[PDB]
Amino acid sequence: MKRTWQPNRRKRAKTHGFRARMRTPGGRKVLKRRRQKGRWRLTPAVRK
Amino acid sequence: AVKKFKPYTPSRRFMTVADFSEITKTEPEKSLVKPLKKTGGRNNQGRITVRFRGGGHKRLYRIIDFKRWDKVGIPAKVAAIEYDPNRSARIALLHYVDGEKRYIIAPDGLQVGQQVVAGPDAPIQVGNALPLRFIPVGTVVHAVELEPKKGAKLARAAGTSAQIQGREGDYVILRLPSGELRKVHGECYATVGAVGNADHKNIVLGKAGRSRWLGRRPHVRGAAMNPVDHPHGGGEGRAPRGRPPASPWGWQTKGLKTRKRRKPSSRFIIARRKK
RNA sequence: CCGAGGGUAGGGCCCGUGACUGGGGCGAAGUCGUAACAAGGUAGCUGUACCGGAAGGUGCGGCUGGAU
RNA sequence: UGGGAGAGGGUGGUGGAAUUCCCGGAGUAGCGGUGAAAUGCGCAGAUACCGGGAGGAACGCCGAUGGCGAAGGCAGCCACCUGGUCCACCCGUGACGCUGAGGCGCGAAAGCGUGGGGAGCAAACCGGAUUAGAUACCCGGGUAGUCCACGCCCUAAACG
RNA sequence: CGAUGUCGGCUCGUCGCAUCCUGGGGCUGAAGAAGGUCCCAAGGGUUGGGCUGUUCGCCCAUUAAAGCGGCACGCGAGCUG
RNA sequence: GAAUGCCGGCAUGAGUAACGAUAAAGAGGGUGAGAAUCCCUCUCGCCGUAAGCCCAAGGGUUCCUACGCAAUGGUCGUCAGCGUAGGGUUAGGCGGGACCUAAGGUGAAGCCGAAAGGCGUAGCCGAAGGGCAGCCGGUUAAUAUUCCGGCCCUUCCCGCAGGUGCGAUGGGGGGACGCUCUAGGCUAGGGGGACCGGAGCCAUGGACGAGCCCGGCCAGAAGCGCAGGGUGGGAGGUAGGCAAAUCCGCCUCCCAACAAGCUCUGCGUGGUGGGGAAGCCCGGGUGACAACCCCCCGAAGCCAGGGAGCCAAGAAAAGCCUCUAAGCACAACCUGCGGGAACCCGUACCGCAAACCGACACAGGUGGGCGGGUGCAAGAGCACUCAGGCGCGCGGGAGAACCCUCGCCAAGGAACUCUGCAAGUUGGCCCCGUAACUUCGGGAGAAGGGGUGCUCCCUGGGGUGAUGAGCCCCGGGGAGCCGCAGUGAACAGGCUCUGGCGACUGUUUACCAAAAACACAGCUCUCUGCGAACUCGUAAGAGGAGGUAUAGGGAGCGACGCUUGCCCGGUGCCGGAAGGUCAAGGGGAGGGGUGCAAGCCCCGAACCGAAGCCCCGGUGAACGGCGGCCGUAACUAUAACGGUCCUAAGGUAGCGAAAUUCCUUGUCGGGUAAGUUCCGACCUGCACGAAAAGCGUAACGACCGGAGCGCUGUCUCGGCGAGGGACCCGGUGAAAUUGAACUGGCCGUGAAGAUGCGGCCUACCCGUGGCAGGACGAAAAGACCCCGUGGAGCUUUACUGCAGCC
RNA sequence: GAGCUAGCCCUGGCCAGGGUGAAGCUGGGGUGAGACCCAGUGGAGGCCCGAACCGGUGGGGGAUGCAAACCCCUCGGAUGA
RNA sequence: UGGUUCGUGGAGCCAUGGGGGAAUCUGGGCGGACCACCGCCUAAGGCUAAGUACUCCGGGUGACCGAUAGCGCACCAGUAC
Ligand SMILES: [Mg+2]
Ligand SMILES: [Mg+2]
Ligand SMILES: [Mg+2]
Ligand SMILES: [Mg+2]
Ligand SMILES: [Mg+2]
Ligand SMILES: [Mg+2]
Ligand SMILES: [Mg+2]
Ligand SMILES: [Mg+2]
Ligand SMILES: [Mg+2]
Ligand SMILES: [Mg+2]
Ligand SMILES: [Mg+2]
Ligand SMILES: [Mg+2]
Ligand SMILES: [Mg+2]
Ligand SMILES: [Mg+2]
Ligand SMILES: [Mg+2]
Ligand SMILES: [Mg+2]
Ligand SMILES: [Mg+2]
Ligand SMILES: [Mg+2]
Ligand SMILES: [Mg+2]
Ligand SMILES: [Mg+2]
Ligand SMILES: [Mg+2]
Ligand SMILES: [Mg+2]
Ligand SMILES: [Mg+2]
Ligand SMILES: [Mg+2]
Ligand SMILES: [Mg+2]
Ligand SMILES: [Mg+2]
Ligand SMILES: [Mg+2]
Ligand SMILES: [Mg+2]
Ligand SMILES: [Mg+2]
Ligand SMILES: [Mg+2]
Ligand SMILES: [Mg+2]
Ligand SMILES: [Mg+2]
Ligand SMILES: [Mg+2]
Ligand SMILES: [Mg+2]
Ligand SMILES: [Mg+2]
Ligand SMILES: [Mg+2]
Ligand SMILES: [Mg+2]
Ligand SMILES: [Mg+2]
Ligand SMILES: [Mg+2]
Ligand SMILES: [Mg+2]
Ligand SMILES: [Mg+2]
Ligand SMILES: [Mg+2]
Ligand SMILES: [Mg+2]
Ligand SMILES: [Mg+2]
Ligand SMILES: [Mg+2]
Ligand SMILES: [Mg+2]
Ligand SMILES: [Mg+2]
Ligand SMILES: [Mg+2]
Ligand SMILES: [Mg+2]
Ligand SMILES: [Mg+2]
Ligand SMILES: [Mg+2]
Ligand SMILES: [Mg+2]
Ligand SMILES: [Mg+2]
Ligand SMILES: [Mg+2]
Ligand SMILES: [Mg+2]
Ligand SMILES: [Mg+2]
Ligand SMILES: [Mg+2]
Ligand SMILES: [Mg+2]
Ligand SMILES: [Mg+2]
Ligand SMILES: [Mg+2]
Ligand SMILES: [Mg+2]
Ligand SMILES: [Mg+2]
Ligand SMILES: [Mg+2]
Ligand SMILES: [Mg+2]
Ligand SMILES: [Mg+2]
Ligand SMILES: [Mg+2]
Ligand SMILES: [Mg+2]
Ligand SMILES: [Mg+2]
Ligand SMILES: [Mg+2]
Ligand SMILES: [Mg+2]
Ligand SMILES: [Mg+2]
Ligand SMILES: [Mg+2]
Ligand SMILES: [Mg+2]
Ligand SMILES: [Mg+2]
Ligand SMILES: [Mg+2]
Ligand SMILES: [Mg+2]
Ligand SMILES: [Mg+2]
Ligand SMILES: [Mg+2]
Ligand SMILES: [Mg+2]
Ligand SMILES: [Mg+2]
Ligand SMILES: [Mg+2]
Ligand SMILES: [Mg+2]
Ligand SMILES: [Mg+2]
Ligand SMILES: [Mg+2]
Ligand SMILES: [Mg+2]
Ligand SMILES: [Mg+2]
Ligand SMILES: [Mg+2]
Ligand SMILES: [Mg+2]
Ligand SMILES: [Mg+2]
Ligand SMILES: [Mg+2]
Ligand SMILES: [Mg+2]
Ligand SMILES: [Mg+2]
Ligand SMILES: [Mg+2]
Ligand SMILES: [Mg+2]
Ligand SMILES: [Mg+2]
Ligand SMILES: [Mg+2]
Ligand SMILES: [Mg+2]
Ligand SMILES: [Mg+2]
Ligand SMILES: [Mg+2]
Ligand SMILES: [Mg+2]
Ligand SMILES: [Mg+2]
Ligand SMILES: [Mg+2]
Ligand SMILES: [Mg+2]
Ligand SMILES: [Mg+2]
Ligand SMILES: [Mg+2]
Ligand SMILES: [Mg+2]
Ligand SMILES: [Mg+2]
Ligand SMILES: [Mg+2]
Ligand SMILES: [Mg+2]
Ligand SMILES: [Mg+2]
Ligand SMILES: [Mg+2]
Ligand SMILES: [Mg+2]
Ligand SMILES: [Mg+2]
Ligand SMILES: [Mg+2]
Ligand SMILES: [Mg+2]
Ligand SMILES: [Mg+2]
Ligand SMILES: [Mg+2]
Ligand SMILES: [Mg+2]
Ligand SMILES: [Mg+2]
Ligand SMILES: [Mg+2]
Ligand SMILES: [Mg+2]
Ligand SMILES: [Mg+2]
Ligand SMILES: [Mg+2]
Ligand SMILES: [Mg+2]
Ligand SMILES: [Mg+2]
Ligand SMILES: [Mg+2]
Ligand SMILES: [Mg+2]
Ligand SMILES: [Mg+2]
Ligand SMILES: [Mg+2]
Ligand SMILES: [Mg+2]
Ligand SMILES: [Mg+2]
Ligand SMILES: [Mg+2]
Ligand SMILES: [Mg+2]
Ligand SMILES: [Mg+2]
Ligand SMILES: [Mg+2]
Ligand SMILES: [Mg+2]
Ligand SMILES: [Mg+2]
Ligand SMILES: [Mg+2]
Ligand SMILES: [Mg+2]
Ligand SMILES: [Mg+2]
Ligand SMILES: [Mg+2]
Ligand SMILES: [Mg+2]
Ligand SMILES: [Mg+2]
Ligand SMILES: [Mg+2]
Ligand SMILES: [Mg+2]
Ligand SMILES: [Mg+2]
Ligand SMILES: [Mg+2]
Ligand SMILES: [Mg+2]
Ligand SMILES: [Mg+2]
Ligand SMILES: [Mg+2]
Ligand SMILES: [Mg+2]
Ligand SMILES: [Mg+2]
Ligand SMILES: [Mg+2]
Ligand SMILES: [Mg+2]
Ligand SMILES: [Mg+2]
Ligand SMILES: [Mg+2]
Ligand SMILES: [Mg+2]
Ligand SMILES: [Mg+2]
Ligand SMILES: [Mg+2]
Ligand SMILES: [Mg+2]
Ligand SMILES: [Mg+2]
Ligand SMILES: [Mg+2]
Ligand SMILES: [Mg+2]
Ligand SMILES: [Mg+2]
Ligand SMILES: [Mg+2]
Ligand SMILES: [Mg+2]
Ligand SMILES: [Mg+2]
Ligand SMILES: [Mg+2]
Ligand SMILES: [Mg+2]
Ligand SMILES: [Mg+2]
Ligand SMILES: [Mg+2]
Ligand SMILES: [Mg+2]
Ligand SMILES: [Mg+2]
Ligand SMILES: [Mg+2]
Ligand SMILES: [Mg+2]
Ligand SMILES: [Mg+2]
Ligand SMILES: [Mg+2]
Ligand SMILES: [Mg+2]
Ligand SMILES: [Mg+2]
Ligand SMILES: [Mg+2]
Ligand SMILES: [Mg+2]
Ligand SMILES: [Mg+2]
Ligand SMILES: [Mg+2]
Ligand SMILES: [Mg+2]
Ligand SMILES: [Mg+2]
Ligand SMILES: [Mg+2]
Ligand SMILES: [Mg+2]
Ligand SMILES: [Mg+2]
Ligand SMILES: [Mg+2]
Ligand SMILES: [Mg+2]
Ligand SMILES: [Mg+2]
Ligand SMILES: [Mg+2]
Ligand SMILES: [Mg+2]
Ligand SMILES: [Mg+2]
Ligand SMILES: [Mg+2]
Ligand SMILES: [Mg+2]
Ligand SMILES: [Mg+2]
Ligand SMILES: [Mg+2]
Ligand SMILES: [Mg+2]
Ligand SMILES: [Mg+2]
Ligand SMILES: [Mg+2]
Ligand SMILES: [Mg+2]
Ligand SMILES: [Mg+2]
Ligand SMILES: [Mg+2]
Ligand SMILES: [Mg+2]
Ligand SMILES: [Mg+2]
Ligand SMILES: [Mg+2]
Ligand SMILES: [Mg+2]
Ligand SMILES: [Mg+2]
Ligand SMILES: [Mg+2]
Ligand SMILES: [Mg+2]
Ligand SMILES: [Mg+2]
Ligand SMILES: [Mg+2]
Ligand SMILES: [Mg+2]
Ligand SMILES: [Mg+2]
Ligand SMILES: [Mg+2]
Ligand SMILES: [Mg+2]
Ligand SMILES: [Mg+2]
Ligand SMILES: [Mg+2]
Ligand SMILES: [Mg+2]
Ligand SMILES: [Mg+2]
Ligand SMILES: [Mg+2]
Ligand SMILES: [Mg+2]
Ligand SMILES: [Mg+2]
Ligand SMILES: [Mg+2]
Ligand SMILES: [Mg+2]
Ligand SMILES: [Mg+2]
Ligand SMILES: [Mg+2]
Ligand SMILES: [Mg+2]
Ligand SMILES: [Mg+2]
Ligand SMILES: [Mg+2]
């Protein structure tokens, strides 16, 4: 049956995207942490 | 008249529609329609603030002239009477001799081809706008401004009307459709006559589907809920209210007056609604 | 082929009968009240409506077959 | 053809009196009600009086033993649309008539449906008295209804 | 109680005998036939339905008889639910 | 040495279950160290509204080719969506961008918020919507509307010529719209042809035939033809379309008018460019100078912005046209022609699936288009089959129990059982014919029954032709033939009587409840006069509503029919400007501290002083309530009646052993041979009752009861048969569980149910297929129960607060 | 965190075929006119049968599954809330 | 109301959301309600090194670890998943 993952590249980008993150004080701080952790990709890679 | 249907289906049995015989044109004036942004009950927060709404038939807001003193002395020919889905009432398409076309809430007894006019000097005839101070006392009137130059507010719904009961200084005394006796400013425009389509109230929807067409989504009794939801929630099996009957928000829904007491407009309200 | 009739199925009328139920007639030596006949002690009757242990009462309109 | 009387009917208007209610003014120890009372109303200011507003219903005097209609019925007043009927002329038609099983229409009040309207009145109902009891009569309240539009209902001491 | 699944039904049995039947008897207010009552006896047998979830019971038609109990009110790593 | 400890390794179960749809396989030939599994041929089966083809998501090299088989592949492997390497994605016209707007998002102005931030008409962003210029064929191992070929076309720049008041983000027009039904004429697609083309074939008894088999088109500017869409013309006036206006709107006259005209699109033809089968031969050659036509069927697609009807009344903006404004008129725009210019991104391959979402090459999920033929009334249904694609990534055997799915069955026909659960029966279409009841629609496919194939003969109406042949469609009437059987296979109601609940179609516990529950039209209370009430928010702002009492919010009830009684003491709500109480504050008699003093400081009575409560009254479709004892009638029984106590007032109508009745399987009647159920009554209703509505009600129901008919393996009562497992052999090979084990019965004993203690009895060692009584078997640190001064959700006249309102 | 799920908003798309035959319209009958009746036309509906599609009624299978909700048969809605 | 040890306490002091509202030294604040006395200080403007906190980085040193330890990572680790 229909499951929880229904990939959509626009939805993925317009939600967890870098521009979404930087728009919000919570999101900006997410990037801070991920960067501080040394994480290789601060934002979900998506194929545009 | 109100059209009745033969019961060839369970819900056709009680379903009744309007007669639509007063209607002359079946298309809206393109010049005068704008798209209606549907709200679905929700506000700018996205939050439902009025419940059980949405999914109504797509409708197109016909711009109505509630000022009408916008064109004093300038007459107009009643060109057509049209359907307006945005209101209980019917609308009339006025071809002003100025060339300008406008919509007004069609009064009861209007005529395709009759001419009307707004102004103090205007006759006391159907569909004519005047300030109240020039309208004869006792004459029935509709579409009344509440304050000067603020647009018609009172008596706009189908069949509704107000009657002048006398004057007192700058103000006059109106009997609003509710039955409330209120002081309206004498310089407020009103249109002699009563709103047409008086048969509106005698319409039986007939089915659950028709309510949906009107954007009215199903209502849920407080009693049919749980304690987290409604004050009337819970109870094993059915149950009486078990408290004073209340809204979902707790406030009492039987008899409790909610109009603000120190409201400045109290000075101009004589007698509260009756019945 | 038709055909007495037999068979399956479904209707219509009439008769007997039926837990129980409704009111009716007669019985009288019972209990309850006293509605009508006199102005019957609130004039009566009537169609209708509602109501009451019961007769009845009351409303609305009608008749005199109402005393004075 | 020429007249006439009349609450005959339908619709739209409009006029005064009175009751109730609301606001104002003035005034105070009771008002009300009955066979007598009580319930009720009244110093939280009633009743009685004056001014004003809202609203509904019914139309005093004329009014009469009267008029009209087939009956039910119909009453302040104006206009409109409309029926029946009586009189004179003796002019036209030339028996074209009377009656009427069925049929159709009308049909007081009460009652019903949808919607308005609601002052007075008032089934139901509540209370006060009377009573042996009083699910009545009398008294203070009071809901349908009484009123309008529309459709039913089709009864009567619808009687001369 | 770091779990010993519960009524009744179905299936499959097996056991006790305080025996319902059949077998052997004593007494009888046992003439006969049919019973009553106690004794010995567990080998085998102990039907089909109606009602109710029912066990139980009542009822129908039979029968030699339509026994009563134990086995975690036998049996859900066998079924039903 | 233990913590159901943590991390790792390795055991057990065990050569065990399984190896993923029962659509299916066999042989021959090649390759290779190795072949059931890779390649080739033949034979067989499966899908064919797909299991075929094409899009869009998503995936991201999986594409093609060469070389490989450690691992991945549920087996094998020489093969592969796997490993290595190389190659492959070509656009002014397809899609998106350099165009437009939708919700929404963002947001100059502005508003708000302790900060972070929240809003906000315009503008901008935003598309699978509007707009917009490419069709046919050929070519590669792999791309093509992209390369090539032919035939067409758009925009931009420049120039030429002719034309004109040119000129805009400004004005107007247009773009611009629903649902259902639908006309005319075409196209797509399809069927037939005795006509045209074609390699061939004559078998096995017949056929050299109007024989069989195969094919008989595609695109194409201008012009023309057919079919449709769009659209009135001229003048005069003009005060409106926030400037201007010759445009638009409005008024008037004159013509035109269901036409014509002008214009746009579709289809046909169209110069020209292509394609072109079966068979045969080693993807290509051939067929072939291929033929390329006629008749019929015909769309849901095109003409289209067509028509009609209906109510629930059906986007925007740009492109486009027109109007003018600054400006500018040797400029500009328009029209034709010519030359030049035309960028970015995508393009492979999967795409109902082994490449997407499901940890898997997972019997699941995934939007749009195409989806042929014949037969069955029709159709996308069903059976077969074309094209195309597959036989499902372990096999070979055996022919036990048992399980699954399926077939049949003597006599009986529900005796089964909680229940006809299940399985039978019934089954499409044409005709005949259909009851109570009813809201007159229905109930109704009621019920029940007759017909159903084929052959010959006769005749009727339609469509396309022409009015005829031919084709196709819809019939009618005779007379015959065969079988057990004619919707001969597949797809396709069992029916009736009667009660409860709910009016009804709908909705719901995603993953144990689809119901009587929720919703529902409808009814009634109630709040709200508009900056509405109410809701969200600290606010701004929103929703309500661009609505205005025939409206909007809240509550209850729940189509409809007939109805909805009595109690206002208490609670709630509404009204009451008296009275009583009541906080801050006003007031300051009086009293105090301190100072030598004026002074400073402090306590402080009467008195005034809101809402709220008290208080007076109203209110039930507001929260709610709606008694008891005793006496009494020509026999008994009973109580119309009376008496009394209590109450705020003591249940009205209707209904009642009921979705309610404890006693209870109440009593009586019905049905049955027998009825704790069911239906009808009765009423001492433990403990119905009138909008938490009362009582009924046609129709409706995968709701829950009762009965009968029909038919049945449900049963008496089981038997046989089929396939997939189970079993055997080859390949691969788990799992929970597991203190260690050399793990028997009885009777006892033992923490009270012993393989493990005692006494007996019995017992050679080890397996395999089977059954489940025991190991208080496995699983889950019992959901029940209790306990903990454990935790949560919910309630209130518990406490104490806060928002909110006064 | 609304790529599952709930509701709403914008913009698109889908629902083979068959059956029933409301209003209306026309013609006729009827009447003072009517109401109304009758035939033909017409094509309404939370209308009927039934695919796609949306469901999830009963049974069986499955239960270390093909599957952390599947499979077979049966059944509901299918122009509409 | 907050701050201070100060929870309304006899509650001053410092700060201030509301209302009232001065004076310039003969001004004013304070020394724990208040009054006197004796004293201390000069509010409603601003700036100011050093001594102090921390350790991304660099270095030195360990009765610190020695690959289940020591940082999550000694290894291409905030990676694979
Ligand atoms: Mg789905
Ligand atoms: Mg996941
Ligand atoms: Mg996307
Ligand atoms: Mg997208
Ligand atoms: Mg890096
Ligand atoms: Mg109709
Ligand atoms: Mg019906
Ligand atoms: Mg109508
Ligand atoms: Mg339209
Ligand atoms: Mg529009
Ligand atoms: Mg527009
Ligand atoms: Mg917004
Ligand atoms: Mg938001
Ligand atoms: Mg009208
Ligand atoms: Mg209404
Ligand atoms: Mg109504
Ligand atoms: Mg509603
Ligand atoms: Mg509701
Ligand atoms: Mg609930
Ligand atoms: Mg909640
Ligand atoms: Mg609550
Ligand atoms: Mg409750
Ligand atoms: Mg609950
Ligand atoms: Mg409840
Ligand atoms: Mg209850
Ligand atoms: Mg005002
Ligand atoms: Mg008497
Ligand atoms: Mg009397
Ligand atoms: Mg009398
Ligand atoms: Mg009595
Ligand atoms: Mg009375
Ligand atoms: Mg008189
Ligand atoms: Mg007379
Ligand atoms: Mg004469
Ligand atoms: Mg003569
Ligand atoms: Mg009458
Ligand atoms: Mg009357
Ligand atoms: Mg009384
Ligand atoms: Mg008495
Ligand atoms: Mg009275
Ligand atoms: Mg008389
Ligand atoms: Mg336990
Ligand atoms: Mg013995
Ligand atoms: Mg003896
Ligand atoms: Mg004897
Ligand atoms: Mg003997
Ligand atoms: Mg003995
Ligand atoms: Mg024995
Ligand atoms: Mg034995
Ligand atoms: Mg025995
Ligand atoms: Mg039974
Ligand atoms: Mg015997
Ligand atoms: Mg015993
Ligand atoms: Mg026991
Ligand atoms: Mg047991
Ligand atoms: Mg037992
Ligand atoms: Mg079990
Ligand atoms: Mg059991
Ligand atoms: Mg069950
Ligand atoms: Mg159960
Ligand atoms: Mg561990
Ligand atoms: Mg083996
Ligand atoms: Mg084993
Ligand atoms: Mg085995
Ligand atoms: Mg095996
Ligand atoms: Mg399997
Ligand atoms: Mg199968
Ligand atoms: Mg197989
Ligand atoms: Mg097969
Ligand atoms: Mg070989
Ligand atoms: Mg096919
Ligand atoms: Mg590759
Ligand atoms: Mg490949
Ligand atoms: Mg390998
Ligand atoms: Mg190898
Ligand atoms: Mg290798
Ligand atoms: Mg392998
Ligand atoms: Mg696998
Ligand atoms: Mg590869
Ligand atoms: Mg090109
Ligand atoms: Mg483009
Ligand atoms: Mg550019
Ligand atoms: Mg753009
Ligand atoms: Mg914003
Ligand atoms: Mg700003
Ligand atoms: Mg686009
Ligand atoms: Mg394009
Ligand atoms: Mg091509
Ligand atoms: Mg290529
Ligand atoms: Mg020009
Ligand atoms: Mg110009
Ligand atoms: Mg323009
Ligand atoms: Mg057509
Ligand atoms: Mg073509
Ligand atoms: Mg031969
Ligand atoms: Mg063709
Ligand atoms: Mg003018
Ligand atoms: Mg202008
Ligand atoms: Mg001009
Ligand atoms: Mg052509
Ligand atoms: Mg060729
Ligand atoms: Mg050649
Ligand atoms: Mg040749
Ligand atoms: Mg040739
Ligand atoms: Mg044709
Ligand atoms: Mg169609
Ligand atoms: Mg159209
Ligand atoms: Mg724009
Ligand atoms: Mg100029
Ligand atoms: Mg560029
Ligand atoms: Mg490509
Ligand atoms: Mg592909
Ligand atoms: Mg699928
Ligand atoms: Mg598809
Ligand atoms: Mg495919
Ligand atoms: Mg594949
Ligand atoms: Mg997959
Ligand atoms: Mg994978
Ligand atoms: Mg596979
Ligand atoms: Mg799959
Ligand atoms: Mg699908
Ligand atoms: Mg068929
Ligand atoms: Mg089907
Ligand atoms: Mg099929
Ligand atoms: Mg096939
Ligand atoms: Mg397989
Ligand atoms: Mg049989
Ligand atoms: Mg039988
Ligand atoms: Mg039975
Ligand atoms: Mg069944
Ligand atoms: Mg069949
Ligand atoms: Mg019958
Ligand atoms: Mg039939
Ligand atoms: Mg044959
Ligand atoms: Mg069928
Ligand atoms: Mg019952
Ligand atoms: Mg229901
Ligand atoms: Mg349903
Ligand atoms: Mg569920
Ligand atoms: Mg759940
Ligand atoms: Mg669901
Ligand atoms: Mg779950
Ligand atoms: Mg669940
Ligand atoms: Mg259901
Ligand atoms: Mg109702
Ligand atoms: Mg607003
Ligand atoms: Mg608003
Ligand atoms: Mg608005
Ligand atoms: Mg309810
Ligand atoms: Mg009360
Ligand atoms: Mg009260
Ligand atoms: Mg009271
Ligand atoms: Mg009282
Ligand atoms: Mg109050
Ligand atoms: Mg006083
Ligand atoms: Mg003093
Ligand atoms: Mg002192
Ligand atoms: Mg007060
Ligand atoms: Mg009540
Ligand atoms: Mg109470
Ligand atoms: Mg007696
Ligand atoms: Mg009673
Ligand atoms: Mg009974
Ligand atoms: Mg009860
Ligand atoms: Mg009990
Ligand atoms: Mg009982
Ligand atoms: Mg008994
Ligand atoms: Mg009997
Ligand atoms: Mg039962
Ligand atoms: Mg009964
Ligand atoms: Mg009894
Ligand atoms: Mg009840
Ligand atoms: Mg109640
Ligand atoms: Mg009932
Ligand atoms: Mg009825
Ligand atoms: Mg019923
Ligand atoms: Mg159901
Ligand atoms: Mg069997
Ligand atoms: Mg077999
Ligand atoms: Mg074997
Ligand atoms: Mg013991
Ligand atoms: Mg024991
Ligand atoms: Mg033992
Ligand atoms: Mg030992
Ligand atoms: Mg065992
Ligand atoms: Mg087993
Ligand atoms: Mg053991
Ligand atoms: Mg066990
Ligand atoms: Mg266990
Ligand atoms: Mg478990
Ligand atoms: Mg634990
Ligand atoms: Mg525990
Ligand atoms: Mg639980
Ligand atoms: Mg405690
Ligand atoms: Mg304790
Ligand atoms: Mg606690
Ligand atoms: Mg708690
Ligand atoms: Mg708030
Ligand atoms: Mg409030
Ligand atoms: Mg969603
Ligand atoms: Mg489709
Ligand atoms: Mg259809
Ligand atoms: Mg029509
Ligand atoms: Mg239809
Ligand atoms: Mg339907
Ligand atoms: Mg259906
Ligand atoms: Mg299912
Ligand atoms: Mg279910
Ligand atoms: Mg089966
Ligand atoms: Mg499961
Ligand atoms: Mg179905
Ligand atoms: Mg439906
Ligand atoms: Mg819709
Ligand atoms: Mg403090
Ligand atoms: Mg203290
Ligand atoms: Mg302090
Ligand atoms: Mg301050
Ligand atoms: Mg000093
Ligand atoms: Mg200070
Ligand atoms: Mg001090
Ligand atoms: Mg001191
Ligand atoms: Mg200073
Ligand atoms: Mg500093
Ligand atoms: Mg220094
Ligand atoms: Mg420093
Ligand atoms: Mg270092
Ligand atoms: Mg070392
Ligand atoms: Mg290591
Ligand atoms: Mg480590
Ligand atoms: Mg080591
Ligand atoms: Mg580590």
Tab-separated table of N, CA, C and O (backbone and C1' of nucleotides) in Angstrom, chain F residues 637-643:
chain	number	residue	atom	x	y	z
F	637	A	P	-63.089	-9.974	49.117
F	637	A	O5'	-62.460	-9.706	47.678
F	637	A	C5'	-61.461	-10.567	47.150
F	637	A	C4'	-61.259	-10.342	45.674
F	637	A	C3'	-60.848	-8.937	45.266
F	637	A	O3'	-59.461	-8.700	45.436
F	637	A	C1'	-62.613	-9.668	43.879
F	638	U	C1'	-61.762	-4.748	42.591
F	638	U	C3'	-59.607	-3.967	43.187
F	638	U	C4'	-59.539	-5.443	42.843
F	638	U	O3'	-58.441	-3.261	42.805
F	638	U	C5'	-58.744	-6.302	43.793
F	638	U	O5'	-59.235	-6.210	45.124
F	638	U	P	-58.954	-7.368	46.182
F	639	A	P	-57.914	-2.031	43.693
F	639	A	O5'	-58.989	-0.889	43.432
F	639	A	C5'	-59.264	-0.444	42.110
F	639	A	C4'	-60.543	0.350	42.045
F	639	A	C3'	-60.454	1.761	42.624
F	639	A	O3'	-61.257	2.654	41.855
F	639	A	C1'	-62.098	0.521	43.795
F	640	A	P	-60.553	3.838	41.033
F	640	A	O5'	-61.720	4.892	40.789
F	640	A	C5'	-61.829	5.591	39.558
F	640	A	C4'	-63.227	6.113	39.360
F	640	A	C3'	-63.741	7.039	40.453
F	640	A	O3'	-63.321	8.382	40.306
F	640	A	C1'	-65.323	5.353	40.094
F	641	C	P	-62.374	9.064	41.411
F	641	C	O5'	-63.311	9.223	42.689
F	641	C	C5'	-64.633	9.728	42.581
F	641	C	C4'	-65.447	9.352	43.791
F	641	C	C3'	-64.905	9.843	45.125
F	641	C	C1'	-65.403	7.549	45.296
F	641	C	O3'	-65.247	11.189	45.401
F	642	G	P	-64.102	12.239	45.813
F	642	G	O5'	-63.873	11.962	47.365
F	642	G	C5'	-64.945	12.072	48.290
F	642	G	C4'	-64.632	11.387	49.597
F	642	G	C3'	-63.408	11.892	50.340
F	642	G	O3'	-63.656	13.084	51.064
F	642	G	C1'	-63.385	9.531	50.303
F	643	G	P	-62.463	14.126	51.331
F	643	G	O5'	-61.603	13.429	52.475
F	643	G	C5'	-62.209	13.050	53.700
F	643	G	C4'	-61.315	12.148	54.511
F	643	G	C3'	-59.893	12.632	54.723
F	643	G	O3'	-59.788	13.644	55.707
F	643	G	C1'	-59.853	10.360	54.122
